[PDB]
Every structure is written in structure tokens, then in C-alpha cells.
Design a protein around this ligand. Structure first.
Ligand SMILES: CC(=O)NCc1onc(C)c1-c1ccc(C)c(S(=O)(=O)NC2CCCC2)c1
Length: 114
């Protein structure tokens, strides 16, 4: 579906996050081979990234805004779960997620299909 809320997540939320200076590690799936992390996929069972979310928004994959929101959440949560407390990546995720939440607080309240 196209909804008012999904249009918002696409044109306001993703728009802001995608171009953020800290976005680059999150624009594509975590590549466990490239990064030397052979336990990554044993720990994280549902990988998620903004490239996947963006593509899903562009292709009208989502039925409701909450589904898109859950994918954003999964991406951040995977990052906090997998990495060490002191890894810079965790700070970058937090910075992006703060913006995610700020923008979500202003999303149109009632979902309507267009
Ligand atoms: C999709 C997603 O969540 N990506 C971020 C992410 O989540 N878990 C891992 C691991 C990652 C992640 C993705 C890409 C890179 C390159 C890295 S890193 O730790 O090697 N580099 C960081 C420190 C220096 C700059 C960035 C971590």
C-alpha cells in the first residue's frame, strides 16, 4: 500500500537518515566476510539495513508504517546487540536513531491508504 504515513517515512525520515554523515555503514547489509565477523549471522538472525528499507519504500512493499518502523528498529537493535559497548558504530547508530525517533513523533497520526 501507499499510505500518508509511508510517504512520510520515505520523504521525511529516510530522506534525513540516508544522507546523514553517519549513514554510510548502514546503507547496505553488514557484510560478515568483508568485516571479518564469522559469528555475525549466528548472533543476528534478521539482518536489516537502510538500503533494504529504502528499496522497500520505493517499491511499495510495506502495508503499514509500523512495518517500516519495525525494520528501522531491527537494524538499530541488531547493531546494539552484536557490537561491543565501546564500538564507535554504536554511537553512530544512536545518533541516527535519535533522528528517527524525533521524526517519528511528528508522523501523521492516522494511517490512510492513497
Ligand atoms: C546495517 C548496519 O547496521 N550497519 C552498521 C553495522 O552494524 N553492525 C556492524 C558490524 C556494522 C558495520 C558495518 C560496516 C562497517 C564498516 C563496520 S566497522 O565497525 O568495521 N566500521 C565502523 C567504525 C569505523 C566506521 C564505522 C560496522
Amino acid at each position: 500500500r501507499v499510505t500518508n504515513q509511508l510517504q512520510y517515512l520515505h520523504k521525511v525520515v529516510m530522506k534525513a537518515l540516508w544522507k546523514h554523515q553517519f549513514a554510510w555503514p548502514f546503507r547496505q547489509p553488514v557484510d560478515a566476510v568483508k568485516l571479518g565477523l564469522p559469528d555475525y549471522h549466528k548472533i543476528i538472525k534478521q539482518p536489516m539495513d537502510m538500503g533494504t528499507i529504502k528499496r522497500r519504500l520505493e517499491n511499495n512493499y510495506y502495508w503499514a508504517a509500523s512495518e517500516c518502523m519495525q525494520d528501522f528498529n531491527t537494524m538499530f537493535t541488531n547493531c546494539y546487540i552484536y557490537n561491543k559497548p565501546t564500538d564507535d558504530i554504536v554511537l553512530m547508530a544512536q545518533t541516527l536513531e535519535k533522528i528517527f525517533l524525533q521524526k517519528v513523533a511528528s508522523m501523521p497520526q492516522e494511517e490512510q491508504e492513497l
